[PDB]
């Protein structure tokens, strides 16, 4: 445990996103350490509104050499029912510096536990692992999931 403190804005954003105006709801959001590296703050200009393929424009928002936390409101259509569920994404590219990777990995629990009720976590360590839709579908519901983000898999 690095000991960093999660800002209250993260918890408020998660609380708003978990429950279900529509044009202002958030589909994706990015978390990052502050400049002094003691708070998991919200990135100001890196988010997607529900009113505004969303997964493609979310993946390219991730930096290529730094680690980030994300909360994606992934929607999918299974055989028996259609459901939308939040996914906590830990983006830790291999090209990232050692210090950033270690600090983000050791402090992942501090933010994951503060957002109670989350059940799906995707740990993406490379661009191939995050661009891959099949792994996200498997994480969501496994073989039961047939269509993700409104498109067939």
């Amino acid at each position: 445990a690095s000991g960093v403190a999660v800002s209250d804005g993260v918890i408020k954003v998660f609380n708003d996103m978990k429950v279900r105006e529509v044009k202002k709801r958030k589909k994706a959001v990015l978390f990052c350490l502050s400049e002094d590296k003691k708070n998991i703050i919200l990135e100001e200009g890196k988010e997607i509104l529900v009113g505004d393929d969303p997964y493609a424009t979310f993946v390219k928002m991730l930096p290529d050499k730094d680690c980030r936390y994300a909360l994606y409101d992934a929607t999918y259509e299974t055989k028996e029912s259609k459901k939308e569920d939040l996914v906590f994404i830990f983006w830790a590219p291999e090209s990232a510096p050692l210090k950033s990777k270690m600090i983000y990995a050791s402090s992942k629990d501090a933010i994951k536990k503060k957002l109670t009720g989350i059940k799906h976590e995707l740990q993406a360590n490379c661009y191939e692992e995050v661009k891959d839709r099949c792994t996200l579908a498997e994480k969501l519901g496994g073989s039961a999931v047939i269509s993700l983000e409104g498109k067939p898999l």
Binding site: V6, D8, I11, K113
Partner: protein, 606 residues
């Protein structure tokens, strides 16, 4: 009624070093409650001798709390199980049962209307849950904590507020109902142990392990002040308790002292130094009416004296560990009950008034296997540290008394007239005369388990695993085997001569109590059936006509010697715990102890 509970000597709270202990108080201000093992103890605050015990949890109970209406109590155990049970009736019938999360439960809080319960702890997927008491449906979400939550409190006045303190050095503040996260206060730098709202709700205080107490407003959560200025205590504060008038605060900390603070002016009103040893650390505190309770690390409960801070009004002692042995002795005109637990502590209780205390000085260091009283007013106790201690019963001081060291660990001890003691060890029988070892029966051909000495001080009956009781004669400084083999139905677990020496009662693991008549050649007099589990303890009533046997079936039977078919059935004298030992105060009072560290008295009517 065949039997009736007369007095209950409650166990001391189970406290652990560095862990806060939570003591709850009733709205009516009559009984304060704590937990010990699987038992929840409600001790009368005015008279600590009077007490009640509720034992229905299958795991270790952590915290119990009275409902604001005062009719129900919710208690949670380490398995995440929460039980809401009635308190008006002595049965304590279960009302509701829930499992909010799969993990240890740390604190419980109620709303003013007494219909919503918030339970906090460390679950697998959550750290707290607030729900309706009659349905278990969630009426809010407890978020904002990434570690175990140690305390929780709910504002008792409108608007309702909720405050939680956890181990991430932060305290979360929620508004409701429905309870929604409002903000996290991170003023503290160590584990936040206790968070308590004032009775009027205008302010609430958070205490942590960094020695700081912070007073915040009870409605907005903004910081009002810090008690003591730079710091409140020289050590971690484990519990705080607001005064009933909501202007003074009582704090108990790990620096071996308690304090009374004037919250409105931020000044310390009183300072009570509790000691200078590790066991004197205070882990819990309570302020109910004029009673100020502080729980030490040893489990003793100190009634703080405002006028004389150095000396508390009362130091309620007792056993916080499972009691293994129990005996009685009539000194002067008053009867004392002496109980020894598995930590070496020996405690004496008044039979009538209920006042209890402990022998001064340092004594046994391990489990006290057996205790007995001789004709010279001395307590002979054989313990697991390979020691038999002769302690004078009038000085009540361990220093300067007799200690005899045995090479093998003793398991039972018995005494008789003439300064003769027979100590059974693991595969050995030892005779002590005038606190000196003078004979050993090492390699006796069997495994002795229990020993009884005839009241005449001539015959000794020793039981074994094989199920045979063997008779020895104490001649001079030696034991001579008489070649007599009394037969039982199984491995002998306890043997006890009658007070007049006319009968020898042997209990075995075959759930049978065989009484042999000493007068007619040690022949079998009667066999008593009715136990459905292994019998562990047996005692002889003073009238030489009845005897009481307690077993692993959580059952006690009082047998009449003349008629084996008539018996008094005490069912669950100590719930969920078998009776470890028992004795007789007189012909109508039976004292029973168990592993719940509690001593009870029963009036038996034939």
């Amino acid at each position: 009624m065949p039997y009736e509970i007369k007095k209950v000597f409650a166990s001391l709270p189970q406290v652990e070093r560095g862990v806060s202990k939570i003591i709850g108080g009733d709205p009516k201000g009559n009984n304060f409650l704590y937990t010990n093992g699987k038992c929840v103890i409600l001790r009368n605050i005015d008279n600590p001798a009077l007490a009640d015990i509720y034992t229905e949890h299958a795991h270790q109970v952590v915290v119990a709390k009275y409902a604001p209406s005062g009719f129900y109590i919710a208690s949670g155990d380490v398995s995440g199980k929460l039980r809401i049970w009635d308190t008006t009736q002595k049965e304590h019938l279960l009302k509701y049962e829930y499992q909010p999360f799969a993990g240890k439960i740390k604190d419980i809080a109620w709303t003013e209307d007494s219909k919503r319960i918030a339970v906090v702890g460390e679950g697998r997927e959550k750290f707290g849950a607030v729900f309706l008491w009659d349905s278990g449906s969630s009426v809010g979400e407890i978020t904002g904590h990434n570690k175990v939550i140690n305390s929780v409190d709910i504002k008792q006045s409108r608007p309702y507020r909720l405050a939680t303190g956890s181990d991430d050095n932060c305290a979360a503040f929620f508004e409701g109902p429905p309870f929604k996260f409002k903000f996290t206060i991170g003023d503290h730098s160590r584990f936040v142990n206790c968070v308590r709202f004032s009775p009027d709700g205008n302010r609430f205080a958070t205490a942590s392990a960094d020695g700081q107490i912070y007073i915040y407003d009870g409605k907005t959560g903004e910081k009002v002040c810090a008690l003591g200025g730079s710091k409140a205590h020289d050590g971690g504060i484990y519990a705080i308790s607001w005064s009933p008038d909501s202007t003074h605060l009582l704090s108990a900390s790990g620096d071996k002292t308690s304090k009374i603070w004037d919250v409105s002016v931020n000044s310390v009103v009183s300072t009570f130094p509790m000691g200078s040893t590790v066991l004197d650390q205070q882990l819990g505190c309570l302020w109910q009416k004029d009673h100020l309770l502080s729980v030490s690390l040893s489990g003793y409960i100190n009634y703080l004296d405002r006028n004389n801070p150095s000396k508390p009004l009362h130091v309620i002692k007792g056993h916080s560990k499972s009691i293994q042995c129990l005996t009685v002795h009539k000194n002067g005109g008053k009867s004392y009950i002496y109980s020894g637990s598995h930590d070496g502590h020996i405690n004496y209780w008044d039979s009538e008034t209920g006042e209890n205390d402990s022998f001064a000085g340092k004594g046994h260091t391990n489990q006290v296997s057996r205790m007995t009283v001789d004709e010279s007013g001395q307590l002979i106790s054989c313990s697991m540290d390979d020691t038999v201690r002769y302690t004078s019963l009038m000085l009540r001081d361990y220093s300067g008394q007799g200690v005899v060291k045995l090479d093998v660990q003793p398991k039972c001890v018995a005494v008789g007239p003439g300064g003769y003691a027979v100590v059974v060890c693991i595969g050995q029988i030892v005779l002590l005369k005038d606190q000196r070892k003078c004979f050993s029966i090492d390699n006796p051909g069997y495994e002795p388990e229990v020993v009884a000495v005839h009241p005449g001080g001539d015959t000794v009956a020793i039981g074994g695993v094989d199920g045979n009781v063997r008779l020895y004669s104490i001649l001079g400084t030696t034991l001579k085997d008489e070649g007599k083999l009394l037969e039982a139905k199984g491995p002998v677990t306890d043997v006890a001569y009658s007070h007049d020496g006319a009968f020898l009662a042997v209990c075995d693991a075959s759930k049978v109590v065989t009484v042999f008549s000493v007068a007619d050649g040690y022949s079998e007099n009667n066999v008593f059936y009715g136990h459905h589990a292994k019998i562990v303890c047996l005692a002889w009533s003073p009238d030489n006509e009845h005897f009481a046997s307690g077993g692993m079936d959580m059952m006690v039977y009082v047998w009449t010697l003349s008629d084996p078919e008539t018996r008094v059935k005490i069912q669950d004298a100590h719930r969920l715990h078998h009776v470890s030992s028992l004795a007789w105060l007189d012909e109508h009072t039976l004292v029973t102890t168990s592993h719940d560290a509690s001593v009870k008295e029963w009036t038996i009517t034939y």
